[PDB]
Design a protein around this ligand. Sequence first.
Ligand SMILES: *[C@@H]1O[C@H](CO)[C@@H](O)[C@H](O)[C@H]1NC(C)=O
Ligand SMILES: *[C@@H]1O[C@H](CO)[C@@H](O)[C@H](O)[C@H]1NC(C)=O
Ligand SMILES: *[C@@H]1O[C@H](CO)[C@@H](O)[C@H](O)[C@H]1NC(C)=O
Ligand SMILES: *[C@@H]1O[C@H](CO)[C@@H](O)[C@H](O)[C@H]1NC(C)=O
Ligand SMILES: *[C@@H]1O[C@H](CO)[C@@H](O)[C@H](O)[C@H]1NC(C)=O
Ligand SMILES: *[C@@H]1O[C@H](CO)[C@@H](O)[C@H](O)[C@H]1NC(C)=O
Ligand SMILES: *[C@@H]1O[C@H](CO)[C@@H](O)[C@H](O)[C@H]1NC(C)=O
Ligand SMILES: *[C@@H]1O[C@H](CO)[C@@H](O)[C@H](O)[C@H]1NC(C)=O
Lengths: 49, 48, 494, 97
Amino acid sequence: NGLTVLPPLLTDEMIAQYTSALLAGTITSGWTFGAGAALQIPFAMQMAY
Amino acid sequence: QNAQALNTLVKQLSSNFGAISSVLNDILSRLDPPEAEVQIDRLITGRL
Amino acid sequence: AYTNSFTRGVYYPDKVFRSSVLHSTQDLFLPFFSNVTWFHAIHDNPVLPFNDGVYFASTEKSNIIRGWIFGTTLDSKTQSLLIVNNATNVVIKVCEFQFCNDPFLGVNCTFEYVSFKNLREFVFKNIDGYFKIYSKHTPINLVRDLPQGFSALEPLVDLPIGINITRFQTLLALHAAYYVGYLQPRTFLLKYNENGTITDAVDCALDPLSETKCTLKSFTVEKGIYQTSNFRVQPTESIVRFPNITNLCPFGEVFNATRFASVYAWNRKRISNCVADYSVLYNSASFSTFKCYGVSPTKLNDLCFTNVYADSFVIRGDEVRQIAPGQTGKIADYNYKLPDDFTGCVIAWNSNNLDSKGNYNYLYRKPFERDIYFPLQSYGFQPTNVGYQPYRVVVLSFELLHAPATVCGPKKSTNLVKNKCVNFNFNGLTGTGVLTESNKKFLPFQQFGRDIADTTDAVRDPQTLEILDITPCSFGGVSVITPGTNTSNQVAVL
Amino acid sequence: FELLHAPATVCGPKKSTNLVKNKCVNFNFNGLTGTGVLTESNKKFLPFQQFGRDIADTTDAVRDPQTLEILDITPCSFGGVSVITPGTNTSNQVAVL
Ligand SMILES: *[C@@H]1O[C@H](CO)[C@@H](O)[C@H](O)[C@H]1NC(C)=O
Ligand SMILES: *[C@@H]1O[C@H](CO)[C@@H](O)[C@H](O)[C@H]1NC(C)=O
Ligand SMILES: *[C@@H]1O[C@H](CO)[C@@H](O)[C@H](O)[C@H]1NC(C)=O
Ligand SMILES: *[C@@H]1O[C@H](CO)[C@@H](O)[C@H](O)[C@H]1NC(C)=O
Ligand SMILES: *[C@@H]1O[C@H](CO)[C@@H](O)[C@H](O)[C@H]1NC(C)=O
Ligand SMILES: *[C@@H]1O[C@H](CO)[C@@H](O)[C@H](O)[C@H]1NC(C)=O
Ligand SMILES: *[C@@H]1O[C@H](CO)[C@@H](O)[C@H](O)[C@H]1NC(C)=O
Ligand SMILES: *[C@@H]1O[C@H](CO)[C@@H](O)[C@H](O)[C@H]1NC(C)=O
């Protein structure tokens, strides 16, 4: 009837890559990747903070 | 909710809105322009 | 020889003043960068088609081109518009002129008027009998071809000649090339400046960036992706299908009957399994009235029915008006009632020269009810009685419900083409799409299938009982990917 | 009858009046009516143009049919009117904007 659906710009694969990056950052650098550079930290120490 | 919104929109095409028929081609194949236009305006108003 | 029209052949479309506005208009303009035929006048005055209209242009150094002839045969057999400019006097005539075998100028009339270095552009169009002339004269410095550029033409003359123009010819002064370009219904965007002079233009159907300028109402386009249009595939040929029946419907047995029934006991004849030619009944001058409430009488030839019924009886002349949906009265309410949603036509004629004598055989008393101090009354019809004369009325009730059609009019079928986009007509039901083989098991009584939108999903071919699926031909949004117009005029299309 | 907005050649039986500039008047130009202030203008109508139009398709300017000069039409002054008031439980005095 003229009704169509457009695709999203970011495909499910691309979203998965972003959540992967955010997760990898969270695990290996804590919050430092949010503020600036991802600064590696032993996970147990990250938890201490 | 989005599926329901689209299904509702499509189903509205079956409505007459006061016209002799919801089918546009059936109006055009049966009435001359001076009369067909009236029936079509009823469908346009409803569909718009 | 041909040349490039460029951006020439735009005119001020109306006597409405505008300024500093990007206004848009639809009129018969020359399409931008299309070809125009190039004629020469050296060491060439053929008759050209006029089509829907003409841009004309010429280049001069010595005023060789002095006139035009417009008509169909240009030979004194029809009226032909003649325009001639000799020295300082413009002459316009529309006489049935006898033109030469090869008209030139050496160095029953309905109208008369009397008043390279130079480019003289003109536009000729012939709308509802009005010959509209726009033109512009401008200095040039170019011999080889039409100068490239833009400047719009004012309207100068509008002649109510009423002449059917299909061909035209020019007139040359012999001891100056000219161009002929066909106008088309192309929408434009026009840049009116501060003075109100159109200083730039964008043909809508030129190219996808021009569609983008038409969509944004702007001569400048920003970097992005713009939904300028919807691409839809067109059909190739039409497909017409009807049951291959050659029997003709017995209308003569209804309309030319020896005797009509009384209105209290009206007859109802079934018409089926036949070809119904309604042109005979409609074109016949014998009817006093032929009023349709259902469908228009000229559509009856294409359209067809599951059944048609003819309700035949005699009434008094002034009561003809009561046989209609929505009417009330002593006949409409008491002896012959139609549905207020009645579909069909009421046909009647007087029988003053047939039933009248006095003739006392005609008696009168829910929709389509036959109701077989009394309620019963009758007429004595005499030839000396207009509103008191007898009328023979036949009401044709048509059932258009989507079901197998037994009554289909005189239209020949065509062959059916599968897997191609086609304009189809199945028993009067029309639409556009791709007809394919299907696995939809219609039950024997089913003729049409439907979708959620109440549109046709599939049909049963009326000649060969197989089911065809109807899928609309591929379509979708166009979009134009473009950088800044300043960056580039190049574009890409999705 | 051709009623397209263009110079009129056949006009109905009706006497003209004098034209008054820079005042709010009820005008009628060749059958085209409206209300507004008629002023002198610098709008260069082309010889074939009789009426000008705005975005709303309303008349912007007209050519006087007796004397071929262009008059701008500016609708007569208008605006919303607001009443500034302390509650009526304090005072019935108001100011008008
Ligand atoms: C114009 O003519 C040329 C040949 O000179 C041809 O190649 C071109 O396709 C033609 N264009 C149109 C739009 O007819
Ligand atoms: C132009 O042609 C007309 C006849 O149509 C003729 O009477 C007239 O003398 C010619 N030229 C001039 C300059 O008068
Ligand atoms: C003028 O028109 C009439 C038709 O009304 C026709 O009979 C007559 O022959 C025409 N005159 C000439 C000179 O052809
Ligand atoms: C308008 O006309 C004037 C001359 O009267 C000219 O100087 C100007 O460049 C033109 N273009 C405009 C301002 O639209
Ligand atoms: C009735 O008979 C006339 C000839 O007198 C004929 O022209 C007409 O078509 C017939 N009507 C029908 C419905 O066949
Ligand atoms: C169409 O013609 C065929 C013969 O080719 C015949 O068998 C078929 O029954 C006809 N269809 C109808 C609906 O009359
Ligand atoms: C109106 O009258 C004047 C004389 O006062 C005349 O010059 C002018 O041409 C007339 N206008 C029209 C449109 O006839
Ligand atoms: C408003 O007016 C009423 C009298 O009708 C009075 O009783 C009340 O106290 C007043 N309230 C205020 C806030 O002025």
